[PDB]
Write a protein that binds this DNA or RNA. Structure first.
Lengths: 5, 84, 84
DNA sequence: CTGACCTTTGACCTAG
DNA sequence: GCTAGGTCAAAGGTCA
DNA sequence: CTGACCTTTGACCTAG
DNA sequence: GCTAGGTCAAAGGTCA
């Protein structure tokens, strides 16, 4: 649910 | 403790479900906290450079690296993994 | 998980700074939580028999024992240490 | 002898 | 329909 | 002063 | 491209 891979 | 407010650091992705990478960051606040067994452990509020304050996260010492040649190398190495 | 709501159990003192003893208790609520590394771990809300609800504490699985002959023996043993 | 306070239970409703 | 929860009142313990 | 709970404040994500 | 719902972390206030 957060930010960047 | 090991890091101080104002200090520029590298910090691990605080979100477990995401690629393990190292972000440029800054210590905003330190705080003496307490482990499950009541020992004093430091907590560090971290600001992620280039993201706004609403992205600030509390992190354990474990998660915070000194802004060092060797840690920078480790940053680049994790950055390549994550892209690939 | 290992324990269920409604289950009568023994539970460690939740306060590190106090004598390590075992209290008769009851599982009020269980909750799937998350470890520092994002793994699913159960959390247990525990009610301490003979104390009112305002003394209810969240505890890790580690801190909760099955209401068993062997654990009752451990209870007595810790209780004696604590008085002496 | 009384009241405060805790526990365990059976009744019930509601939301899912 | 049944279930898990939540609320509620009855009833018994211990205590000061 | 603490732990639990609840609420508000941004910001994301996944649907549609 | 957008919006609507849920959800998350931080932070703050309340309750006992």
């Amino acid at each position: 649910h957060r930010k960047v891979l | 403790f090991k890091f101080h407010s104002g200090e520029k650091v590298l910090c691990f992705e605080p979100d477990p479900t995401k690629a393990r990478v190292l972000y440029d960051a800054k210590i905003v606040d330190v705080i003496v906290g307490k482990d499950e067994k009541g020992r004093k452990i430091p907590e560090y509020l971290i600001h992620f450079n280039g993201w706004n304050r609403s992205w600030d996260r509390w992190a354990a010492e474990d998660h915070v690296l000194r802004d060092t040649d060797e840690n920078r190398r480790l940053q680049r190495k994790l950055a390549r993994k994550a892209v690939a």
